[PDB]
Amino acid sequence: DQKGPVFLKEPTNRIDFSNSTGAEIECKASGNPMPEIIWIRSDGTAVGDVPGLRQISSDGKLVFPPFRAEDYRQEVHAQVYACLARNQFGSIISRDVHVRAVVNQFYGADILMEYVIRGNAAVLKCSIPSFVADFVRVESWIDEEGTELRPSENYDGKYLVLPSGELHIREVGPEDGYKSYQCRTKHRLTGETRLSATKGRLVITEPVGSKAPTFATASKISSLLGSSSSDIVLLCQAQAFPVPYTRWYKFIEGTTRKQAVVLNDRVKQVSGTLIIKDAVVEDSGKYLCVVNNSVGGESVETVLTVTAPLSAKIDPPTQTVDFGRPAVFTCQYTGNPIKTVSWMKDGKAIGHSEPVLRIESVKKEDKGMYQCFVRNDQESAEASAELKLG
């Protein structure tokens, strides 16, 4: 009984931790005999062991012990890694691992106050530096009365914290001018929380005369995105008079035409704003916010991409073909979107972009492991297969 190696435990394609947190990653594979594990930089070069920063356990595991703020080296803490299992029969490398370590430092948050018409919906977002935006999210909003607000179901009450962390207020009025809100932020890696410094207030203006609807950007296009099985937000910010009614439509694929969105238990609209409770890849497409009014109307396009995890499967996982015959391999994948598709043999980065691999004629040199690679900007996945000779 003998066969090549196969990846069982693959490190997460993206890993985030602080300097004080440290990290451990383990790629675990099985094969007969036991394959040897190695780590490599994105360019394929074998990793060196760096004292105090990056070191191989030799157990098939790798670690980044905690380190001083000054001990940070880019080539280590910010890099794309991967795991390589190899033996007599062949070799395979694990899906790309993004290692990102953030040395702990304090940040700040500001809230831009938005002028709003009486009766129209209003929203206050907590502005954050784009660089740490990955690692931090808004935990809650707190009123000057001391009461705090958190995201949830039940979109009633006029006060709701959306999944984006943006505080939404429907049907505003002068009564809402007194109170002022500030947002709480929670850093994922640290777990520490910080409350907004600047106190966001909402200034309402009593409209005089009729005025057509207006968007706060004037750009007719935006590109949204989101993970499947999560609350999604398609926002429309338009202040206008008198008191617009809003309608959202979905374009049919590659069509100038469109059909109206179905408002139901799952898909909900809050006064300007669509929400998808649990998203699926089918919801992806071009969206349109149509906001009308007595005087006139205005429109905004929104591009939505629903993300799904990537996973690959090669078929058959193994086979044996006689000399002078066609070899066949079929890569079956799941997840969306998908941009890159490629192949390789014991590494070597061979092939082209097709879901299928074929060798017109078997040859002695074609034995060993084969691997299918599919991935997008944000993710990656792989599957392994062996080829015996007959």
Added chain:
Amino acid sequence: DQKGPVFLKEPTNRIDFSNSTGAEIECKASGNPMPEIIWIRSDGTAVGDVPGLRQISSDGKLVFPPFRAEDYRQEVHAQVYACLARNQFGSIISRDVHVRAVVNQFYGADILMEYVIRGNAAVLKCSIPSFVADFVRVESWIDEEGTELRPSENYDGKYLVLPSGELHIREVGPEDGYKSYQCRTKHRLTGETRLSATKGRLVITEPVGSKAPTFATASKISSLLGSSSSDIVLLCQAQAFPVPYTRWYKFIEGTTRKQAVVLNDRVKQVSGTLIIKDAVVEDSGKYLCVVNNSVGGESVETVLTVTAPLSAKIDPPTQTVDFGRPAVFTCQYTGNPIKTVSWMKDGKAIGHSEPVLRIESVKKEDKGMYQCFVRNDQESAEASAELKLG
């Protein structure tokens, strides 16, 4: 010598004025006999006199005298008008005249604090409510020190103001975090000037460790509009460490292919910000802002549409065709963009949308005026033509 009606002086499409200013619009026409001029709603009814708010001068001129806010009336000041010149042979309308009177009313502004890392450029936008965006723009920027700044030519040195009104700063450092800036907004109709209450200041983050590039939006697409001969701003908000090199590209029309942008005296790139002086229709197209560095890169694409003044020409201006013979009118227009091209006869909407219309068989009933209507989401224009029977 008999002639059909023709326009000499035609009103401008867009007319905005303050309640305290008041305005007068004029329509002039020619042809023998001299046409009968009538001011009418977009809807075909004769405009009647209203006391003090709206008055028709005996010379064929419409006027809207000043008034107090309490005397504001929607059906007059918010109404869309048109001029109808008429003769025995037929009649023609003018370009759509949008009358909008703004009852003098207050606005405000707030400056979001721009979070930045050392060495990277900074951009302070003066935020303005969506409704007054068209009536208000930023004239100048005043610092904490009280020094004043304007959107001068010679893009160089540290501080710069862009034509779009954003305050730009390069090579930011801790020394520049102490200062606090205030924009200056000027209402175009009244000429009133407001100095922002909120004082924008920059939070400077000492770089610690390497950080992949990040955009302040996370949107991959915007869309910008600007007139020809005016300076346009394509801007990249990406923050990255080590300080990234940025480059702009322009997609080929309808292709995934791309080409680099030509830099010159006219087109000058400031940091991540691309500027196009004296824009022309040829500049319209999709653009791509690319930002890279030792860690990686990220990009966003921007759709640009350059407007051009709409003007229409009909050929032949006049003709005569016998019964049974075909009639032909070619409307050749100017400007950009182009949404619809329509046709009317004697002030009646008919037919289809084409640059050309032909009557396969002429009839006595086809005697009359024909006009070509071109439009976009912003502007409109008209052209007139005579048709006589042989």
